[PDB]
A paper describes a structure:
Routine RT data collection provides a useful capability that is highly relevant to studying protein dynamics and ligand binding without the complication of cryo-cooling.
Other users tend to focus on groups of proteins with homologous functions from a range of microorganisms. Furthermore, they pose a challenge as their heme centre is very sensitive to radiation, and thus careful data collection and analysis are crucial. For the α-helical cytochrome c′ protein from H. thermoluteolus (PHCP), a total of two plates were set up yielding one crystal hit for the PHCP protein under the 96 screening conditions. A structure at 1.88 Å resolution was determined from four data wedges, each of 60°, measured at different positions on a single larger crystal. Notably, because of the high-symmetry space group (P6222), a single 60° wedge gave a 2.08 Å dataset with 99.4% complete­ness, but adding the three further wedges within xia2.multiplex increased completeness to 100% and led to a significant improvement in dataset resolution. In this case, only a single crystal was required for RT structure determination because of the high-symmetry crystal form and the ability to measure data from multiple positions along the crystal.
Residue numbers in the entry:
A (entry chain D), B (entry chain D): 2 to 135
Write the structure that this text describes.
């Protein structure tokens, strides 16, 4: 298997990778601080959908509590008590991530904007329950 | 724009994310230390193709030399002198990553194994020239 420190590293890396690509979509379709490119918005959405489907469940085990990956894990222990809540939030995120990739393929800015907001809410929902605010 | 420390963080995260997914393909089709699942091999290949197409070129600027992202950047300065070599290696990696995703979709273990070896060589080619060995 993976050691705990690998699980933390790989999940921190995965989330950081998604944040870079979320930021590019935000810049092009929400803030307009970057010219809208279909191929780049699509490419960024595809990373988010791909990581969402990569089975990150395997990187969550109680032996990762308090472990340093890149940094000390910010996973809260309540993650392991609230499995109904974890499933609800994770399955919503996967569903929204897929939809974002589907609409970013052909969509205009308004459609992508709507789908992007649903993914952002899904990221935030998990953070609000299961990530330490520092 | 992004600060240098963000560029290093995002590129380290991106490569670490790809290494997790490479490791899963290796386990299932090379070492057989994990039972072969089509959907999981495909899901892992799709992450690699998606990150390969995410325009990581934007995360390489000379102001990132020696900068801490998660860790001190291991980018070598010769990256900025050997642009012909960078282009050759990067375009090969993108091409091999796409092919891996295409064959992992329907492929058997032998086809994926062949495509996986081409991606692994492409990762290594860039490391050999432009990443400090520590
Ligand atoms: C639970 C189902 C989550 C979903 C969906 C997303 N994130 Fe998250 N994130 C989560 C946890 C439990 C943690 C802490 C991981 C750890 O072990 O430390 C995180 C962390 C991040 C980070 C910080 C990464 C780091 O380098 O320390 C970022 C930038 C982040 N997450 C972003 C992010 C985005 C953009 C998401 C949707 C696209 C997203 N996360 C979803 C839990 C969950
Ligand atoms: C150049 C075109 C590259 C290709 C293709 C790949 N990698 Fe790489 N990698 C590269 C550099 C310049 C660096 C250092 C980045 C920095 O600023 O430190 C890396 C680093 C890695 C790492 C370490 C990440 C960390 O957390 O410090 C890993 C695990 C890694 N790279 C893996 C990897 C894999 C699996 C690739 C193909 C699928 C791959 N890299 C390609 C340059 C390049």
């Amino acid at each position: 298997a993976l050691k705990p420190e690998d699980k933390v590293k790989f999940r921190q890396a995965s989330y950081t990778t998604m944040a870079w690509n979320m930021g590019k979509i935000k810049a092009m379709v929400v803030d307009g601080t970057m010219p809208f490119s279909q191929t780049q918005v699509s490419a960024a959405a595809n990373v988010i959908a791909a990581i969402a489907n990569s089975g990150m469940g395997a990187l969550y085990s109680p032996d990762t509590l308090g472990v340093v990956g890149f940094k000390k894990s910010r996973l809260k222990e309540n993650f392991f008590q609230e499995q109904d809540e974890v499933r609800k939030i994770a399955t919503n995120f996967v569903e929204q991530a897929n939809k974002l990739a589907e609409v970013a393929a052909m969509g205009d800015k308004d459609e992508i904007k709507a789908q992007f907001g649903e993914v952002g809410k899904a990221c935030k929902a998990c953070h609000e329950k299961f990530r330490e605010e520092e």
